[PDB]
Each structure stands twice: as structure tokens, then as C-alpha cells.
Design a protein around this ligand. Structure first.
Ligand SMILES: OC[C@H]1O[C@H](O)[C@@H](O)[C@@H](O)[C@@H]1O
Ligand SMILES: OC[C@H]1O[C@H](O)[C@@H](O)[C@@H](O)[C@@H]1O
Lengths: 121, 121
């Protein structure tokens, strides 16, 4: 039963807990770095860090994956892009016309899985 | 429509994009710090940073709020606790038997509001 609730008032500027993304990747994903927090191992190469602007969110996302995450790319509502980073194995799946709220997952020395929470438009 | 999708396999240790929380607070909340990213102003006192364990999430949460956020406390599924931090004003609202996925909000010099995304069990 996924849902959300607002608390408090109407002032201020909006912000998101999903502030920046980087990855370590080779032929698959070694790690995802979320808001500077490292999730995964130390292999592969480190990508640049994508920092979302105010009012910017992931609107499209392509993940190549098998038993492990092989490739990530995304696009934002402002027309900016991240990736593709990773390899060409696994199967591709796309989220289209979304707003990504959160990225959880599972990682060891490599990135096993991602759980993407989002609104579908 | 709020939903989620899983990509990848079953290995590794679970993690969350929402990996640590701290606040600045006096009589109300000046800021919330999510994964080290500062959201709000410089007033009040800095709380310690709660860092979630793998597979640990907010299961219960009490927020005191009015037109601004007044107080935050939460408990995790592992029995650990954060807060209460803040003042005693506003009205209290509780999320019970949940799994918090994301904390967004709105802030200027203080914490105006929070948008809490969560699973309701
Ligand atoms: O991504 C998995 C693996 O792919 C490549 O072989 C290299 O870049 C490694 O360092 C990396 O760990
Ligand atoms: O909480 C709002 C306000 O409360 C108190 O008066 C002080 O601790 C301030 O520094 C703080 O900004």
C-alpha cells in the first residue's frame, strides 16, 4: 500500500531526498552512489555525479539488468541525461513519463538490484 | 499513480536512497539533513545523524507540525529510535506500522513541510 502524506505548511522551496546520483561501472554496475552515499563495491570506474536542480526529477529511465544491474541511463524533466553507464548484457527495461521519488536496492561487491519508486504519468 | 518496480536479482544486502537523517532544531525545525544534504537554515542545534542499517527502515513516525515542522521522532523496525527533536507546539500526527520510502519537503530558512512517501502495512 504505497502512499504519501504532507505535514506542515505552504512556504519554502521544494526539495527531494533524491539529490544526486553517481555509479561505479564496468561491464555491469559495481555501485550506485546516492546523495554521496556509496552502495556497492569498489570495482569498475566512477562516473560523474548528477545533481538534480530545483524542480528537476527523473522522468525516463532505462535499466539493463539480469541477476545483476548491467546498465543505467536516465533523462530528467529538464531534458538532461545521465549515462548510459555499464555494459550491454542483460535485458533492457524502460520507465517512461514518470517522476522517480526514490531508488532503493540491494548491493554487495556489485549492484544486485534496484527498487525504483515512482509516479507513473 | 505511485508505484514501484524491481530490477535485477536477489543477492547483496538491502540499502535505501534514504540512508541517514539529522535535523537542526530549536523550538521548531530549522532544517532536515538527508544523507548529509542540508535542507533548511542554519539556526537551532544540530542533532546527531541517524544512519539506517541494511534492511532497517522507519516503521513508526511522529511529526508535530503547524505551518512549519515543529518536532520529529521515529522508530525503526529494529527498535532503534531518533528524536524527539524540536518544540512542543503544533499538532501531532503519527504514521504507524509503515515502511518509509522517501522524505521530500519544502524549506527556506526553516523547515516548512515534509512529504513522506511510505508503504502502509
Ligand atoms: O563491472 C564489473 C567489472 O567490469 C569490468 O570487468 C571492470 O571494469 C571491473 O573493474 C568491474 O568490476
Ligand atoms: O527552532 C527555531 C528557533 O528556536 C529557538 O529560539 C533557537 O534555538 C533558534 O536558533 C531556532 O532557530
Amino acid at each position: 500500500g504505497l502512499t504519501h502524506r504532507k505535514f506542515g505548511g505552504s512556504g519554502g522551496s521544494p526539495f527531494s531526498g533524491l539529490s544526486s546520483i553517481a555509479v561505479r561501472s564496468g561491464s555491469w554496475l559495481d555501485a550506485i552512489i546516492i546523495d554521496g552515499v556509496h552502495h556497492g563495491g569498489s570495482g569498475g570506474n566512477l562516473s560523474p555525479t548528477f545533481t538534480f536542480g530545483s524542480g528537476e526529477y527523473i522522468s525516463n529511465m532505462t535499466i539493463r539488468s539480469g541477476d545483476y544491474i548491467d546498465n543505467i541511463s536516465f533523462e530528467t524533466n529538464m531534458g538532461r541525461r545521465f549515462g548510459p553507464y555499464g555494459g550491454s548484457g542483460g535485458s533492457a527495461n524502460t520507465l517512461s513519463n514518470v517522476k522517480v521519488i526514490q531508488i532503493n536496492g540491494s548491493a554487495g561487491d556489485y549492484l544486485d538490484s534496484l527498487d525504483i519508486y515512482y509516479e507513473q504519468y
